[PDB]
Amino acid sequence: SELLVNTKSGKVMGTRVPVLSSHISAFLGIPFAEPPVGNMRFRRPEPKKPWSGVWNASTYPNNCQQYVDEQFPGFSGSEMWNPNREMSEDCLYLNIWVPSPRPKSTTVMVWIYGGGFYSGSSTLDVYNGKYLAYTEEVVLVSLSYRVGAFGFLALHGSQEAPGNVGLLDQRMALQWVHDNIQFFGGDPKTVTIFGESAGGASVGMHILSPGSRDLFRRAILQSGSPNCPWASVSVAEGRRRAVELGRNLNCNLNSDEELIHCLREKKPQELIDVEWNVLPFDSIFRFSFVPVIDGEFFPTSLESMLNSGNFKKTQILLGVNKDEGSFFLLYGAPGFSKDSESKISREDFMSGVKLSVPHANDLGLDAVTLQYTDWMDDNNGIKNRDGLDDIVGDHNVICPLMHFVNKYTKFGNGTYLYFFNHRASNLVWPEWMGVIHGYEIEFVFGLPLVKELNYTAEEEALSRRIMHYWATFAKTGNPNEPSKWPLFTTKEQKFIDLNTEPMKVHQRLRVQMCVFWNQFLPKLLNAT
Amino acid sequence: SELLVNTKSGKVMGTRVPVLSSHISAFLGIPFAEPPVGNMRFRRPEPKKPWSGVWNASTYPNNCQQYVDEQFPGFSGSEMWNPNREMSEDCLYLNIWVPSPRPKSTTVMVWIYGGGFYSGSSTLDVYNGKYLAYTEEVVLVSLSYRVGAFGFLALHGSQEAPGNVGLLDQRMALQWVHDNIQFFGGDPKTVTIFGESAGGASVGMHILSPGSRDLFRRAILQSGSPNCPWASVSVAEGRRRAVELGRNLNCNLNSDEELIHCLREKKPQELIDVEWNVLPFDSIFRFSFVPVIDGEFFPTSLESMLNSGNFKKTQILLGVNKDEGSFFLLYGAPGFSKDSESKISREDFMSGVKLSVPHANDLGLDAVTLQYTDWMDDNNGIKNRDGLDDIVGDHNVICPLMHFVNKYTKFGNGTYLYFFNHRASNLVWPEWMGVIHGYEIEFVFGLPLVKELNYTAEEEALSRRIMHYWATFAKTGNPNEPSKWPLFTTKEQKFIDLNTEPMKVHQRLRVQMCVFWNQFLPKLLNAT
Numbered sequence A, B: 001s002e003l004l005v006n007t008k009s010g011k012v013m014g015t016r017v018p019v020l021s022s023h024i025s026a027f028l029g030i031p032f033a034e035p036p037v038g039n040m041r042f043r044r045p046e047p048k049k050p051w052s053g054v055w056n057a058s059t060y061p062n063n064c065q066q067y068v069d070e071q072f073p074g075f076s077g078s079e080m081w082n083p084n085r086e087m088s089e090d091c092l093y094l095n096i097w098v099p100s101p102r103p104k105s106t107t108v109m110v111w112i113y114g115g116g117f118y119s120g121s122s123t124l125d126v127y128n129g130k131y132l133a134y135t136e137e138v139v140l141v142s143l144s145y146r147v148g149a150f151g152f153l154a155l156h157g158s159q160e161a162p163g164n165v166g167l168l169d170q171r172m173a174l175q176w177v178h179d180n181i182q183f184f185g186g187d188p189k190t191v192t193i194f195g196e197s198a199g200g201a202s203v204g205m206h207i208l209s210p211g212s213r214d215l216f217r218r219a220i221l222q223s224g225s226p227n228c229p230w231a232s233v234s235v236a237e238g239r240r241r242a243v244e245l246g247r248n249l250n251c252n253l254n255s256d257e258e259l260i261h262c263l264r265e266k267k268p269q270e271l272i273d274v275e276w277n278v279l280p281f282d283s284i285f286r287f288s289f290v291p292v293i294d295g296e297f298f299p300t301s302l303e304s305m306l307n308s309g310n311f312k313k314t315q316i317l318l319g320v321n322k323d324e325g326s327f328f329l330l331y332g333a334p335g336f337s338k339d340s341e342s343k344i345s346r347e348d349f350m351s352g353v354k355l356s357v358p359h360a361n362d363l364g365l366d367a368v369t370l371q372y373t374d375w376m377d378d379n380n381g382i383k384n385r386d387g388l389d390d391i392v393g394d395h396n397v398i399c400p401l402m403h404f405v406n407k408y409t410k411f412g413n414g415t416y417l418y419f420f421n422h423r424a425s426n427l428v429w430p431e432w433m434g435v436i437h438g439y440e441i442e443f444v445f446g447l448p449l450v451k452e453l454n455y456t457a458e459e460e461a462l463s464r465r466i467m468h469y470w471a472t473f474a475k476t477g478n479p480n481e482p483s484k485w486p487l488f489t490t491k492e493q494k495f496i497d498l499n500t501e502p503m504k505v506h507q508r509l510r511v512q513m514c515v516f517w518n519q520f521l522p523k524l525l526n527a528t
């Protein structure tokens, strides 16, 4: 039977699912690790013990314990990101969509979900792998990993809560794919890991980490890169945040063991309820528990690894969306709201920049402000709203990614860069947010091919070429079929726009602003 | 007789001069101070003792001792600025052009020549007052003052070389105009002082200095203002430069008196020959001996005076030219030369910015560089040449003037701002220099009305309206006759272009760059 697969871990039984009036097989909720519960909370993951019998893999698994978004109760725009399954610490599962009839040795794609390292689920409707698996004939895998404190509480030096275990969860799922995807007809020597935002920063982290490199072939990073200012912290900051967490729960703080034992006695929601209280600054785009530069998963600082070429050398395809910062200003900067045009006053502009560059002294805040202010028209509310949007996006997503791509390309084997700027005709968010962080995912997963979601025909056509670009690149290391998406080179620095109009090639994506964020501002904060 | 005038200092006899086929009277070379020679070198000026008999004022006087420009032997472009009379320390004279028949009580204009405080002459062909005096019916006065070390060597605390004596020379001539211009038919209650570059910074200095305020009614400043970074130094830097001068002449340096006596024994050319050796940095747009913030002529720092309104409150008309920095890059930055297009390499760009902002640390040089570099096209030689031109102009002339005008307007009684951007059809300098520092003077003095200088008809028409704007403003405090040159207000900040096309009004002249030079960069250099 087509729905039965025997793996090294045991037999698994899937289900047949309809797709664009055809069908494919899906093996949902396959365990790849022991449940990280009880005494295992905060611990490195453990491989799933093989099982006898047949594992029912016909339905989605639980989602990991996480902070649930309540800013807009019932609004689809935000609920589309919330867990759509029961939450549980027992959540280390993966899902596989397999073309029918079962391939023999085809291209494999593994998706790593985003969510600021504090949230996320592999079961979201926007991550439904059937459309892509079906249309491009690829074996599509979505893994899961512990988020928030469960995945990233870091007490460096302790073996009970070393930090980075959520990255180790991802690595375990990648190991499982490597060892078993052949039984589902996937070629383990041709697996592309792709992810968006924290998922994309994760993909870059596996590119850097010696212990992850051998487990995949190529990578795609969407609106995220390993060096993002919000994607990692030092072991000292990690420790300070773990201790502050314990301090919020009235924990004994005398030794690592006393703190960890207390945190392990608390119910999941107890940690989630005080998680946000540990940030060091009033800020936007900063999350409590994230990866730590520990000298293990990351042997040295991310910058020294990037500079010395200490990373997996292969082909990469990555890019950003036009209005990366809007999602974040809506949620936390004064003057912005879901139902107004959010024209921003000069005062709110300034408290907006302060929130965006939390770690900056005054000279630094002035530098940012001057750089983004049109002084011939300083009281223009649209200009102040769009300027903050750019500040947030350039600093947190775009410039860090442009710095990664320029460092990577020096040693890599091929880079393809895109700028996604199509505003979906059916976007439920206000127009002022533009082409929002996370909204290229739906085109990557092919949602525009299902008529009921009522997208336009050109949006469907757009989705199909992005899907074919991603799959052709996973299969060959080149998105083009033998108009061309040119290779990004350290000399030419070319990239393409991704939208419904005829492909247009450009160069040096946001260089002016990125020289300010990658070279000037850091020098300024280091001197003063 | 029309050419005979009896003043409080004695009888003076002028000469009749032809102008645009008519005639006016000129009284050239009238002494207003005792010759500042011998033991008076470096000393405050002394009033000219009255003389009996008649003073022959039919020919131009000597020019003060100065560094003579030899960069382009015989090239009219540079020779037009050089002394065209014998140089001598006996040079404190003034010239008057008087309408014929002699007016009874008409508008008076006194011109203060520029020359970086180290050079200049009232007798240059571009300063010929006959055209203006004749066309607008004004009594036009050009004064003179000691430049270089003779006018500005400063050993604060000493009464023998206190500094600022060149400013005191100007003040003495203004005092003489005040006391005697009525005899030439000028109205001493309606005198406008106007000057260009160091002359314009001087005009601003008389506006600030308590001891000069009462001697004039209104002011016009051309491409210069008192707070220019090159127009004044501290008493300590002044002293250090005077001592270094003495050190270049093998002077005894044990006490002020020993140093001053030695400097007074040297022939004029001996001081001029080593004058440039005392600058503290390798720089462009910096001159050795300039005014000193001494607590006397300038009671407190220029900025605190500007901020507190400690200055003469009246109407002012001022402005700048489009390409203020080119003259200076030609003379001293690598990559620039008179006979090539001077496309500048990225390396020369950078040594150009270093030369332009001499007092800046590295962080500061990087700030300037980032601010003026188009990173999508960093190797564009035209862009690098024009960028340096702007840097030099914005930092040394334009932004300082915009800072003065905004501080002044808060307390003044009326401001008119212009941006002069007409490139003369007969300019002998290369095209790459654009609308050069000093080249609006010829239009202010009406040279385009004499056909032999072969200007175009629209350039003549341009000269006539600038001449009438300047004179109507000197006469009334408003350049407009009752299309309008609007008043510059702290709210609207309006200004006009001055060229051969229909008047166009704009606002916030170079605000973007001037916020960088007047607010950001100073804060940066103060922090780091």
Ligand SMILES: *[C@@H]1O[C@H](CO)[C@@H](O[C@@H]2O[C@H](CO)[C@@H](O)[C@H](O)[C@H]2NC(C)=O)[C@H](O)[C@H]1NC(C)=O
Pocket: A412, A413, A414, A415
């Ligand atoms: C990716 O790597 C391969 C080699 O591992 C590159 O192909 C080689 O290109 C050189 C030219 O410098 C040839 O001499 C070799 O014979 C090629 N090897 C093979 C097996 O093709 C390829 O150019 C690299 N791509 C990029 C963009 O760097």
Ligand SMILES: *[C@@H]1O[C@H](CO)[C@@H](O[C@@H]2O[C@H](CO)[C@@H](O)[C@H](O)[C@H]2NC(C)=O)[C@H](O)[C@H]1NC(C)=O
Pocket: B412, B413, B414, B415
């Ligand atoms: C220049 O100063 C004069 C006053 O010295 C200003 O004219 C006065 O304007 C006020 C209005 O606020 C009237 O009440 C006075 O009666 C006016 N005085 C005279 C004698 O006219 C004039 O507005 C000032 N100009 C500018 C641009 O500030």
Ligand SMILES: COc1ccc2c3c1O[C@H]1C[C@@H](O)C=C[C@@]31CCN(C)C2
Pocket: A069, A078, A081, A113, A114, A115, A116, A117, A119, A120, A196, A197, A198, A437, A438
């Ligand atoms: C690092 O960026 C993120 C930080 C927080 C959140 C999201 C982020 O990226 C967005 C897209 C997707 O990756 C998942 C969740 C996001 C959208 C929903 N919000 C409420 C939570």
Ligand SMILES: COc1ccc2c3c1O[C@H]1C[C@@H](O)C=C[C@@]31CCN(C)C2
Pocket: B069, B078, B081, B113, B114, B115, B116, B117, B119, B120, B196, B197, B198, B437, B438
């Ligand atoms: C502060 O600016 C100056 C510094 C030096 C010089 C000049 C300056 O302004 C120019 C215009 C006019 O004022 C007089 C001389 C200038 C032109 C001739 N050069 C050689 C000397």
Ligand SMILES: *[C@@H]1O[C@H](CO)[C@@H](O)[C@H](O)[C@H]1NC(C)=O
Pocket: A056, A058, A059
């Ligand atoms: C698999 O699990 C689902 C969900 O509880 C159940 O409804 C379905 O019938 C199961 N199939 C088998 C054979 O266990």
Ligand SMILES: *[C@@H]1O[C@H](CO)[C@@H](O)[C@H](O)[C@H]1NC(C)=O
Pocket: A426, A452, A453, A454
């Ligand atoms: C499709 O469009 C209809 C028509 O208004 C709307 O009611 C429906 O909610 C849309 N469906 C989706 C998935 O948005």
Ligand SMILES: *[C@@H]1O[C@H](CO)[C@@H](O)[C@H](O)[C@H]1NC(C)=O
Pocket: B056, B058, B059
């Ligand atoms: C004035 O001086 C000039 C220059 O030397 C001389 O030629 C002229 O005749 C003089 N006039 C008188 C009356 O002294």
Ligand SMILES: *[C@@H]1O[C@H](CO)[C@@H](O)[C@H](O)[C@H]1NC(C)=O
Pocket: B426, B452, B453, B454
């Ligand atoms: C006027 O134009 C002529 C014609 O070429 C030229 O020879 C002369 O030098 C010009 N005069 C001036 C003042 O430049």
